[PDB]
Design a protein around this ligand. Structure first.
Ligand code: CL
Ligand code: CL
Ligand code: CL
Ligand code: CL
Ligand code: MG
Ligand code: MG
Ligand code: NA
Ligand code: NA
Ligand code: NA
Ligand code: NA
Lengths: 352, 347, 355, 353
């Protein structure tokens, strides 16, 4: 009665059902509803998470247990990472457990890797598609993603499906050139009509023109020093710039120039966040600048209004979105996939 | 590569690997190590549980998330139950170094086995299987997997000393079904089924019994003090496992108060959890100083503090700990064959 | 000169209370403040009374457990710090500690109270906050006697406030205790204060001697650290024509219980709602509810009794009995402490200048 | 039986009457070291996680912090409150420290947190300085520069002048406004007549830079959100030792020392001295904005567990950086010591509480 959906199976389901329309009509609505559902009864749906460092002498992994009990999506996400897993290349490893919302029976076990990357990319586009519609005329023709891996992949993939006619060049930036070139190839083979280039953080002058010709910038890095520099971004107010930052999850992690973060604060710009509580306790871009909850707006709240001059720096046309991750994202998207994935893309277990 | 171990897979592995030697040499030591490991750094090994009642309508189910991070057994047991009744969930086993998913167990059989293994872990220490003053009958109040695994493990351990097993329940159907499965399995043992009200019929069997097990969700004591053997020449070990909330009780509160006022220490799995969940201790007013943990019985002596000298009776109350499920789940995961598991590649 | 702090000692609190406690004062001043605190807390619980910190002493020569209970209400900000345990009980100290009152805007220290009298008064004020609402002082179905199980300050303030409120309706007060010494001392002190009321002292074992008074009683108070029910169902009046209100305050740990567990189970199976101060704290601290299996849905908070008028959910029609269980809330100590600090005269306080 | 209210003036009295080089080394510093080491041994059992709650009043911007400490010998709680409104009124962080009986939990002492916090913070600063830069050192510049004013700067300077009497000849107080700086120069001048006290503005760089380049001890007591202590203002000769104790930062957006020096120290593998690696990495902007990790940090008590200090010294300059965020054990161990040693002349004793 349970289904084990592996990382490959998730990517299969997504690749088979992810289109511009599907994102707008199926995926995004579920995530928006989950984010709104969570915001209504936050402490009852996502109880305080349990974080425990490994009690094994041969491991530096920290295990975090994040339960989610929504009216419709019930379960638990357990993710684990740290130096050893990072150095070994495994990174954050774990799974998402989906339960019956009425009985509590085990219905699905997902691999958290792909699921986390997809829900994070769907959250980034949930705000991007709201502030910069795909019919907008103020979009520069290039996209720059700082980072590699599943996070950068799904961010690029989803954005290329949404802004197909407007994005012609994708620039992948990373600390090491190996994994960046690996992503450039995989994305190049998948999207033939898009030119994919890979740069190193030191190849400034070489990517700086591309960064100044970019309207969508993605932060998918575990950086402790800002990789997106204010002087590398377009400063023309006629063109809109939407920066979705997802990499930082600790106060010492930051991706966007702290001067720009302070400039946005002093200029009265509200930053888009997934959760004001978590971002002001986990996002170094906000923690190191002294941002307050009143100068923040949550993604679901962007769909409750149409006035967005509060989230835009009028001197440059720049908008900042910071995502830290929420278990409702994993549970609402995992429940959706579980109820629509075919047995060809799932390990169905009978008599569990 | 993770492995889905279903209830049938667990019972298969267990029935295929459970012997007196296996219990004494492999299974019991793992639980003792888990209980000992937990007792050293309790809040670091088993963090406080997360309990949230359904935020969904048309449901009265409460979901409980119990993480366990031992040096060797890492994961979480998620159980959910409540009105509209049973308790369903699963146990997740992770790689102790990477945090990758290694195993998914069904909590049903795994919980019953570890509870029965915990009951015998204290029993075999106080009433060794080589005892010569052991009454020949066993009485288990309850049915289901809990009663089954309790009886099977005890009958494998005290084979030559236990000749009659009496199954007691509120309904006689599930009692006779357990008599059948255990009767076909143990041909040299007489299995009898009784009702909780048929006192005049089971009182002789209860007074000819040295092992009494409480596997019932009763809210009123089903094991009565005057139905037990009171001869100081014979030892009696009562393991209570059914109660998990303060309003649930299985053993006569008069016997509980006599043991308290006579200075008898009750064997427990965890003093903290039992004094917050077991009605036998909460409704009698027991204190931590008059309690002893199962793992502590293997690190010291008894001093007869866990035995009432006027009756020869020993009382053990177990409420359950996540370390029990994960230490036994890791052992099964590392020893279960691919025939008894759903092996998933490239998870 | 600078900023000033106020040290209000136990004697200072009792002086203020004895000098300002009247039927009108309780109805018009003290109870209203407590009701507002309970309602304010119920609105934003986790922000006003944050989760308490409990730590057992890290000293070897000590078995004391320290509890830190902060309260940040819109008007009453501070913390109540209480510490107790076996050694504290063996020495007669019991729960010792203090209540800190802060400036609601700046956070400067304004007052330091002794927790003893303050806790006892607010607990008794909570009992009458529900009692005066369910059993009005003009009620016509009330027996003429009151029975309090226990002695000490808790029993004292419970009796005193109830006798100031129900002057003509309570004629005999029966004090029950494990020892008769402390019971007779309370009869004396309360007898000197209330001349028109008959005070009698009995032992918990002198059944048949107090049962007639217990069956002629409409208000029963539980002020005992009992771990075994001292208020037994067969000693209480079971006549539905007479109203009985049982306010229990003694139990604060799951193994502590004051009311017959049979009656607790009878109330559960009959669908009766029990009055509590806080559903969360009572279901985690009161043995009367934890050992009976009570649920939040079959409970009602005291302040909520002022949000409805259908008290048939809190009354078992088979007996006419109502049960109220109090475990304690930090908001109670601070809302009453803030009131006292803002109304105490310099004669009944040690005013410290330039703190 | 009685409790004791110890007011700010009472604390300053007791300290001024009992603070000497020997007293600091033989009584005050040892108590703080024991508290810091005792805390590090069983941290979560002595100082449980603090409760922080913002005002639920609509007419206040103050946030209240409740910090209990349950050590084997010092038991109680520190309550501090601050915020925008409190700072705009000259109040700042206000609160008190409660000392309880270590066996019964009865109220034994109530301190004002203001002076008590400043003293223990200054005692923490000197606990690391006296270990890395002994008072007999010959590579100590003769000037001291303190960035900040108030109680923090006062106790920091006083303690250093009692300890390095023969080595400190000029003290320069720097602040944004000259008012509180001139008041501090006066009070400290009357106490230390043989020391030259000067007051400067944060903008008078051309006037204090020569003094800053002749300074070996620099104290940061400012609530700055932008670094006021600039790398180009420090002495760069490795032949002279420089010890910088930073005290102002308590939130990640607050920084006092040039982030270039913080970034250089990190990339050059220099370990910075801290009171607690956990709290500093969650509250100190000098460490959070530099990306420092616990492995590149050393705690104050740990400086007394070794004798090689080349890991905490930049060899290119001879500079050592120490960052303090505050720990409740410091307030409670100093509150217990004073309460158990203060005479009734410097305390308001309340009987029959
Ligand atoms: Cl396959
Ligand atoms: Cl307690
Ligand atoms: Cl915090
Ligand atoms: Cl803060
Ligand atoms: Mg909303
Ligand atoms: Mg001392
Ligand atoms: Na409520
Ligand atoms: Na000179
Ligand atoms: Na490391
Ligand atoms: Na050490």
């Amino acid at each position: 009665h349970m289904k084990v959906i592996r990382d490959k199976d998730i990517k299969s389901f997504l690749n088979k059902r992810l289109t511009r329309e599907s994102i707008f009509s199926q995926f995004q609505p579920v995530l928006l509803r989950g984010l709104a559902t969570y915001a209504a009864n936050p402490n009852a749906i996502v109880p305080p998470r349990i974080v425990q460092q490994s009690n094994n002498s041969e491991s530096d992994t920290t295990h975090v247990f994040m339960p989610c009990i929504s009216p419709t999506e019930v379960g638990i996400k357990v993710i684990s990472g740290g130096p050893s897993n990072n150095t070994k290349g495994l990174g954050f490893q774990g799974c998402v457990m989906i339960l019956d919302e009425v009985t509590g029976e085990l219905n699905a076990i997902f691999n958290a890797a792909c699921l986390t990357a997809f829900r994070t990319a769907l959250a980034s586009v949930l705000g991007l598609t709201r502030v910069v519609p795909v019919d907008s005329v103020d979009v520069l023709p290039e996209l720059c993603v700082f980072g590699v891996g599943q996070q950068a992949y799904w961010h690029v993939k989803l954005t290329l499906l949404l802004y197909k006619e407007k994005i012609a060049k994708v620039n992948i930036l990373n600390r090491t050139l190996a994994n960046a070139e690996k992503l450039k190839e995989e994305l190049g083979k998948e999207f033939d009509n898009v030119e994919f280039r890979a740069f190193l953080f030191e190849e400034d002058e070489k990517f700086k023109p591309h960064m100044e010709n970019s309207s969508i910038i993605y932060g998918c890095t575990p950086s402790t020093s800002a990789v997106i520099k204010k002087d590398h971004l377009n400063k023309d107010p006629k063109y809109r710039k939407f920066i979705s930052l997802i990499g930082s999850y600790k106060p010492h992690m930051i991706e966007l120039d702290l001067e720009l973060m302070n400039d946005f604060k002093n200029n009265g710009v509200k930053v888009i966040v997934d959760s004001k509580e978590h971002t002001l306790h986990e996002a170094g871009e906000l923690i190191q600048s002294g941002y307050t909850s009143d100068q923040l707006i949550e993604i679901h709240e962007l769909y409750e209004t149409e006035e967005f001059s509060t989230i835009t720096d009028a001197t440059t046309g720049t908008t900042v979105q910071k995502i830290v991750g929420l278990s409702i994202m994993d549970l609402c998207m995992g429940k959706y996939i579980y109820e629509n994935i075919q047995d060809d893309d799932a390990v169905v277990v009978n008599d569990f």
